[PDB]
Amino acid sequence: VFSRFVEVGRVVLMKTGPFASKLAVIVEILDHNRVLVDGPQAITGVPRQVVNLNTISLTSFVVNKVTRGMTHKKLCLRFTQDAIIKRFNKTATGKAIEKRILREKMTDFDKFQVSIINRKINAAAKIAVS
Amino acid sequence: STNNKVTVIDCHGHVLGRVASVVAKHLLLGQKFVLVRCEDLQVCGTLKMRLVQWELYQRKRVNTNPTRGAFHHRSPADMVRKAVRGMLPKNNYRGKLALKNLKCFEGCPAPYDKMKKSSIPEAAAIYSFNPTRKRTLLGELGTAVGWKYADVVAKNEAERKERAAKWYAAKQLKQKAVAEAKEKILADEKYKAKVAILKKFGYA
Amino acid sequence: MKEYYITARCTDKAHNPNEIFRSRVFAPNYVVAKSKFWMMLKKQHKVKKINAELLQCQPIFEKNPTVVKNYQIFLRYVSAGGIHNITKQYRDVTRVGAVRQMYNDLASQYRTRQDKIQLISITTVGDKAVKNPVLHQFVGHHVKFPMVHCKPVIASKRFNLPIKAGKLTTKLC
Amino acid sequence: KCRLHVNAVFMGFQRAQRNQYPNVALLQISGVNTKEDTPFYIGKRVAYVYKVNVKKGSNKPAIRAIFGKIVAPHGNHGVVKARFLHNLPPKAMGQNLKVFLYPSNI
Amino acid sequence: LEKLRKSIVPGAILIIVAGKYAGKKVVFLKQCIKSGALIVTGPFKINGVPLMRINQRYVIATSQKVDVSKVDTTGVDVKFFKKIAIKKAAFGKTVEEDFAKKQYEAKKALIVEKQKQVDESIVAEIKKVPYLKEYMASYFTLKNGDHPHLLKF
RNA sequence: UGUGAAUUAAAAGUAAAAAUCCGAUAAUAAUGGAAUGAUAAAAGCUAUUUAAGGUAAGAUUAAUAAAUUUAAUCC
RNA sequence: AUAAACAUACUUUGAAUCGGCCAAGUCUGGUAAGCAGGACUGGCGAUGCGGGAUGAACCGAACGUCGAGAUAAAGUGCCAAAAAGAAACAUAACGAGUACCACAAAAGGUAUUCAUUCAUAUUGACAAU
RNA sequence: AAUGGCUGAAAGCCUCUCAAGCCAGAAUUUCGUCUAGAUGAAUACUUUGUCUUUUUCUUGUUACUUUAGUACAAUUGAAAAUUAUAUACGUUGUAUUUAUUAUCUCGUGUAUUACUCUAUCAAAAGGGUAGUGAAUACUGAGUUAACAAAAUUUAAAGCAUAA
């Protein structure tokens, strides 16, 4: 049976546009193609808007007691109560999102040490195996 | 520089025409392509529909001399070459040179069975097809029209899966050993100076 | 598609200059909105541009472009056979947003170009007033479906490589 | 010694369906998949370095070059326009062109 | 006199991306006011890059900065660079083939070392930063996935 | 018992921050180039003087105000 | 109102020509014709260029020799320079695919999508038991 | 193929399917068989073992002859299958060209390798065993660079002898 559904309260992940790699919460379903994401603008910065399902991805979290057309005020309370930000950052995608931000601020000197250091570690770890 | 490498394309689960368009464009850009498993491509149409198109194709033949007539190659590796050749410049040095950098084989011969394989997301059958649209493998169509070597390739591919399966298992064991040996020396006290740099950028 | 509020008056012998014609016209730009507005006057009141003064032509903006509403567009279109009246429902957040759906849907199902359709009216209906067989399935509060066969998303054209490495997978998403 | 250039493919001249203008050559820089990554390369040096099998008694160099500059983008798929000192030989279509890192504005 | 880029400040480390010393890293001391070219030194004990002049269009300003005051640049002006330049044998000066350049390097060698007293300060400081001496002495390279429009220095 | 389109009270708010959408526009500018040129002084530009002016909008304060309203003295 | 001084009015001498053909929100004879003949205009003839694969007339636009830039008709999977996203009715078929253009009709289908009207719709309609 | 059927929904029933999935059915199609046939493969003998061109002898080919020039062993490139994919995760976001810290010396042993070479068993294998070398990690230290130069990828002449 399918695990992740496009329902009301499902936490989605924007994959393109100005809010790429920012969390959002579905609060309405117009049809099979468009949903209304209101990933709390006071928390993540995603405005209440209609987006196509080709631009987002589902996650393993659903916010509890979210009704369709929930207001921004009450939605924010349920978002922090579930602690989605805390839970999301421990997932494989959550760590991949922070990795990309970490790498994009490296300098040429920063990349020099990592390539040198990791090469020795990998070589040494291969030696240690009989 | 000079790109002497070969871009090996695994034609499994692709579309015949969509593969050719991407390959035939990049043959004109100096790249050398080898398309292994050109008998696993997919064409839109049931086996009944594909045979009608082949029957129409076989009709085109010079009336006064069939030896000069259009040559209808039944082998899937020659179906792909014909499809690619239709998307290349005709009757010029540029077109002929770009065609010399292309080869299919129905299976995976000795050099190209251990090279790194690529994929063409534009030509994948899971991105361009309705799942309920019936398709036809080139090998299955080739057997219907008179390609005799459909059983040699199926036998050769069978033993290539049994050789790779044991190589993959052996490689998995060594990788697990190296992975667990890296954790031990990542947590060593002497390597803290180096590791502290890696943790800063998230590598470790 | 943008919505406009257009008014005008007729100043000649036939029409008294104290009755103002208002309209709410959906047009790509205000020049087309006046063009639609003048035709409705000439074809319904014998009022011509050369004997009329336009007063106001202002855009109308959605009050709450964050609330999902069910619309009901009453319209008439011309086919090969004759002229018919249709009532099609749409779900969107803006009045102009639903109208563009109607124009694109009519031109696909009925093959009817835009210069055959006259939008009589557009209102907002209840949740149970929707009768479209497909659109009725998403009006409930407990709608839920898994989007299968997802194509993996690319952040931007920056990473759009022609040839990739390895294998390709869809997503249960 | 080191790699200080990015290979670009000399696809062909600026052309139409039945015409051709060899003054401007189109290049496909590696890793530039869109026209928004082009502003970095507008102005960078570009060289077509080829090899000539000279005879022993000839004093001409065995490695010659034609240089040029990237001047503007061409389409939405990160294709650039390059103008050289001398128009590139049409025998060099599909070959590699060194895209340097200077004039540097970094 | 050219207007140098805001990223190019004295003591910063630059990457030479053109010319004879392509791919090397140097330290920018100051700008030759009489010619507008930068006066850099990739300290000779580290990179082997001597004291020279390079136009600012052939260098990339990295974020790594060696600073270093008291560099003692009392000489090293337009006189010094014109003194150590190797000039041709004119036109009417007999024939003087081959040997002219070989002797020139020998006689100008001594003054070249004399002005390398500048490097005595940066060399000591460079060793303070871990992995920096290895970084300076090594050629700059563009590896796989190193797209110049994405790199930042 | 919960959500709630809309409306209402109080706090805050002189009602120009930033982001996205929607409308509106495109040109003044800054930084890199390209094609054809030029090289010398300027109805150049800069500094010092007095002072036509600054029509929402050069600033502030006052009277008051759904104001491109009226004054004052500073720049 | 608008435009017009290399404007306007001409005078003299003379060349070539009076086989024409095409298009159409036009017509007459004809079953019709790439047939015959007309009204108004624009073309081809006398005319190359970009596009329609190719084409006297179609579409854009009319040409001294060139450099750079926006454009026109029209295009953007490959030949072929140039696109990404959205919604649909299509597509189990030599079906669909760039006007003039190089073809298809009447009729039929418990095939399919949408809309209108009517009746049955429950405390129980239809199908089956 | 036409056609006749099976299970079976849509449409609680019915139905061979303008549905998925099957069967039977032609002087039919394709294998099999016959004729011509391109690129090819195996074996026998003659050679050669980094390479080419211009000449040149011969009926012709190969080896062969002369004068040069050129490189000299040692990190490259593989899971398979599915995609409504057992559950979980969604591991996000740049394929090839193109991922090595300048050169040399000094150093100690151990370990490792789809590394090179030798011997052997095998083998149309990124094979096993034994040894050697190379590179790397433990892991250092020291010399040199300033001007100049850092390139093959092939040229030119012959016929003694053998097949």
Side-chain angles (χ1 to χ4, degrees), chain A residues 1-129, chain B, chain C, chain D, chain E:
Chain A
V1 50
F2 303 110
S3 35
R4 333 206 170 176
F5 297 99
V6 185
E7 64 224 344
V8 153
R10 160 80 41 183
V11 167
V12 291
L13 211 159
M14 320 286 275
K15 302 275 279 193
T16 178
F19 304 110
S21 87
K22 306 280 263 320
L23 279 195
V25 170
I26 297 188
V27 281
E28 249 286 344
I29 299 177
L30 277 84
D31 50 56
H32 201 272
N33 292 295
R34 294 163 313 135
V35 306
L36 184 85
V37 281
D38 186 22
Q41 212 180 339
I43 307 192
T44 87
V46 175
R48 177 158 289 197
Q49 70 196 325
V50 188
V51 299
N52 207 274
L53 287 166
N54 310 8
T55 83
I56 66 192
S57 303
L58 319 171
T59 52
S60 41
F61 320 122
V62 175
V63 185
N64 253 286
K65 302 153 300 142
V66 165
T67 73
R68 73 165 179 167
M70 181 152 266
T71 36
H72 174 243
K73 210 177 93 181
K74 296 232 177 27
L75 180 52
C76 281
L77 268 308
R78 318 282 209 279
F79 198 64
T80 81
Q81 156 75 74
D82 286 67
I84 294 305
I85 274 152
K86 303 210 239 189
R87 286 145 55 64
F88 174 68
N89 296 325
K90 292 132 56 144
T91 75
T93 298
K95 310 188 95 43
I97 281 173
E98 291 325 308
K99 269 211 221 280
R100 201 243 319 152
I101 292 164
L102 260 42
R103 311 277 160 84
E104 60 157 39
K105 37 199 207 69
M106 286 212 228
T107 46
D108 188 28
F109 182 41
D110 266 3
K111 305 159 130 72
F112 174 82
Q113 313 142 50
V114 153
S115 100
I116 292 303
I117 285 156
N118 236 335
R119 207 158 155 281
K120 298 226 191 151
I121 286 279
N122 287 350
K126 205 169 220 271
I127 303 307
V129 168
Chain B
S1 72
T2 304
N3 177 270
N4 302 122
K5 302 254 290 186
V6 151
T7 313
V8 164
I9 302 271
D10 198 303
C11 287
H12 186 85
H14 280 33
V15 178
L16 156 80
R18 305 195 160 256
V19 157
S21 75
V22 179
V23 161
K25 185 43 172 149
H26 285 89
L27 283 178
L28 296 165
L29 298 194
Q31 298 200 37
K32 284 201 282 172
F33 278 88
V34 166
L35 329 170
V36 288
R37 263 130 74 83
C38 278
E39 43 88 11
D40 261 300
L41 286 148
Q42 289 166 35
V43 280
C44 169
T46 68
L47 189 41
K48 156 175 295 321
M49 264 175 30
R50 297 319 301 185
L51 285 171
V52 181
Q53 319 305 314
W54 179 260
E55 269 210 293
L56 288 171
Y57 180 37
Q58 251 191 29
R59 277 199 85 227
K60 327 294 192 275
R61 172 207 86 180
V62 167
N63 185 70
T64 72
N65 203 346
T67 86
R68 307 176 92 116
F71 304 130
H72 323 275
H73 294 258
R74 292 135 192 94
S75 159
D78 274 319
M79 291 195 228
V80 193
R81 170 171 232 93
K82 172 213 177 311
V84 164
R85 190 188 77 237
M87 315 182 183
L88 283 162
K90 310 259 193 333
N91 287 332
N92 57 356
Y93 168 79
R94 178 162 160 261
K96 291 159 208 335
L97 186 68
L99 195 44
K100 293 175 54 71
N101 311 352
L102 173 92
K103 311 179 167 144
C104 312
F105 316 96
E106 267 79 23
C108 269
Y112 320 107
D113 56 8
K114 288 189 250 307
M115 306 195 182
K116 280 205 216 76
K117 283 93 164 183
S118 296
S119 289
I120 307 173
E122 295 117 297
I126 51 189
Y127 297 139
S128 75
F129 257 117
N130 197 308
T132 48
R133 216 81 208 175
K134 294 206 253 150
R135 277 105 64 187
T136 291
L137 291 202
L138 274 197
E140 148 200 4
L141 164 67
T143 314
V145 309
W147 174 57
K148 340 163 166 181
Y149 311 112
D151 43 84
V152 184
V153 185
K155 199 230 301 195
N156 284 345
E157 280 318 281
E159 71 145 30
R160 195 181 63 77
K161 310 294 183 37
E162 86 203 355
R163 274 178 328 162
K166 63 150 46 64
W167 157 88
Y168 167 70
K171 195 203 72 203
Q172 280 304 280
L173 289 193
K174 195 136 278 292
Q175 272 204 121
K176 283 305 150 316
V178 176
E180 84 169 16
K182 201 207 183 133
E183 319 245 9
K184 233 198 65 57
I185 87 184
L186 273 182
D188 192 271
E189 100 196 58
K190 173 251 168 173
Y191 276 114
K192 175 33 52 183
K194 290 178 197 59
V195 169
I197 303 170
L198 294 181
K199 313 291 298 320
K200 183 154 55 164
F201 315 116
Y203 262 65
Chain C
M1 238 37 65
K2 297 183 262 315
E3 196 177 11
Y4 289 94
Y5 174 86
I6 314 161
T7 51
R9 95 214 197 95
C10 185
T11 50
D12 53 5
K13 158 210 92 69
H15 304 74
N16 61 281
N18 292 306
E19 150 210 288
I20 312 299
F21 313 97
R22 337 168 283 204
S23 291
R24 299 185 68 160
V25 194
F26 296 87
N29 65 75
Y30 89 99
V31 183
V32 179
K34 287 185 211 165
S35 149
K36 289 192 184 325
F37 177 76
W38 286 129
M39 205 37 88
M40 301 189 322
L41 290 189
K42 164 180 147 187
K43 293 289 179 238
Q44 290 172 31
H45 299 266
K46 300 191 108 138
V47 176
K48 297 187 144 194
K49 204 166 51 194
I50 207 52
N51 296 307
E53 329 175 307
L54 198 95
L55 311 185
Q56 288 140 14
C57 178
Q58 330 168 354
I60 302 175
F61 302 117
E62 195 54 76
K63 191 132 98 187
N64 42 20
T66 55
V67 176
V68 177
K69 325 152 189 85
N70 318 275
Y71 288 104
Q72 202 190 252
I73 290 178
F74 192 50
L75 67 103
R76 47 152 286 177
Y77 79 104
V78 190
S79 75
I83 302 149
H84 323 276
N85 304 334
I86 319 293
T87 320
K88 295 267 301 200
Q89 325 229 351
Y90 294 98
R91 280 176 68 75
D92 208 308
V93 303
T94 37
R95 266 183 309 262
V96 293
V99 163
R100 183 84 275 186
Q101 304 204 249
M102 188 266 302
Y103 275 144
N104 290 355
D105 168 74
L106 274 278
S108 190
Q109 152 102 47
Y110 290 141
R111 289 261 201 267
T112 294
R113 321 276 191 284
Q114 70 96 32
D115 51 44
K116 276 175 152 40
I117 301 158
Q118 262 158 53
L119 182 132
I120 284 146
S121 99
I122 164 162
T123 88
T124 291
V125 290
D127 193 278
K128 84 216 196 75
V130 179
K131 302 301 184 334
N132 201 317
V134 159
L135 207 66
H136 190 40
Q137 316 197 78
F138 305 92
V139 300
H141 301 259
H142 294 353
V143 187
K144 151 173 100 85
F145 55 93
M147 65 202 210
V148 315
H149 217 75
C150 268
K151 188 161 140 40
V153 200
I154 319 295
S156 94
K157 272 204 61 147
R158 181 193 247 139
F159 325 96
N160 209 36
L161 300 157
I163 290 143
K164 267 198 53 162
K167 286 165 163 211
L168 306 165
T169 79
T170 58
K171 286 229 185 135
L172 220 35
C173 206
Chain D
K1 227 77 198 76
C2 51
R3 186 174 85 71
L4 289 162
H5 67 81
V6 174
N7 275 327
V9 196
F10 169 42
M11 314 197 324
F13 310 116
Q14 203 200 26
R15 74 167 307 165
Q17 213 165 304
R18 279 150 207 123
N19 275 289
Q20 163 166 280
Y21 316 107
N23 264 348
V24 177
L26 312 170
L27 314 180
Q28 182 184 104
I29 311 158
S30 321
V32 198
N33 311 291
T34 164
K35 70 159 173 168
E36 48 171 358
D37 308 338
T38 324
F40 178 87
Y41 300 98
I42 303 308
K44 300 283 168 296
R45 216 77 199 151
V46 159
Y48 167 63
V49 180
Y50 55 105
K51 208 184 315 301
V52 164
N53 41 332
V54 317
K55 331 293 252 176
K56 274 141 100 171
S58 321
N59 39 325
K60 301 278 265 290
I63 291 265
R64 309 112 178 281
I66 308 178
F67 290 92
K69 251 198 190 183
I70 296 167
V71 300
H74 181 81
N76 314 341
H77 216 72
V79 198
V80 305
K81 292 188 201 167
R83 325 174 57 98
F84 295 80
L85 255 286
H86 301 118
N87 311 351
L88 291 187
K91 98 200 199 48
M93 311 215 178
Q95 316 267 249
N96 294 306
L97 264 68
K98 296 175 158 177
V99 176
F100 294 122
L101 310 180
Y102 59 96
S104 196
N105 288 306
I106 314 146
Chain E
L1 201 62
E2 326 190 7
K3 170 154 77 54
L4 298 194
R5 307 184 226 127
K6 267 160 274 183
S7 39
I8 299 198
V9 288
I13 300 181
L14 320 171
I15 296 177
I16 306 185
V17 283
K20 168 187 197 167
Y21 295 88
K24 285 286 214 194
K25 287 142 214 146
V26 290
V27 173
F28 164 68
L29 317 172
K30 63 173 191 291
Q31 188 203 24
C32 180
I33 48 165
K34 308 302 280 166
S35 90
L38 322 176
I39 303 163
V40 302
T41 166
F44 186 87
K45 272 267 265 204
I46 316 198
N47 311 337
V49 182
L51 210 41
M52 61 205 268
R53 261 178 322 185
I54 175 149
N55 210 26
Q56 90 168 323
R57 68 197 267 108
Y58 301 122
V59 300
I60 306 184
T62 57
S63 202
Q64 215 52 45
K65 154 205 315 301
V66 94
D67 268 330
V68 153
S69 303
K70 65 219 193 48
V71 200
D72 204 10
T73 83
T74 53
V76 301
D77 282 11
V78 76
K79 309 179 69 222
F80 161 64
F81 290 116
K82 270 183 161 182
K83 254 174 297 158
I84 60 165
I86 319 291
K87 316 187 279 190
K88 304 312 191 33
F91 151 75
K93 292 303 296 213
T94 81
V95 296
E96 294 188 345
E97 276 270 86
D98 289 335
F99 79 102
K101 314 290 277 185
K102 153 92 190 68
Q103 326 321 309
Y104 273 166
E105 164 69 14
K107 47 194 302 164
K108 316 273 191 170
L110 44 103
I111 167 68
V112 163
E113 332 292 328
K114 149 81 212 297
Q115 296 290 342
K116 293 318 268 154
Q117 44 92 0
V118 167
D119 259 340
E120 88 149 60
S121 34
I122 294 169
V123 161
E125 195 288 342
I126 272 171
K127 311 273 229 270
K128 292 196 186 227
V129 184
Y131 289 130
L132 191 50
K133 200 254 207 169
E134 280 78 44
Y135 167 76
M136 293 268 328
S138 56
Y139 276 92
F140 171 75
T141 186
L142 274 163
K143 307 164 160 314
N144 218 62
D146 264 358
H147 305 303
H149 59 278
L150 291 198
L151 306 189
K152 48 193 261 149
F153 317 89

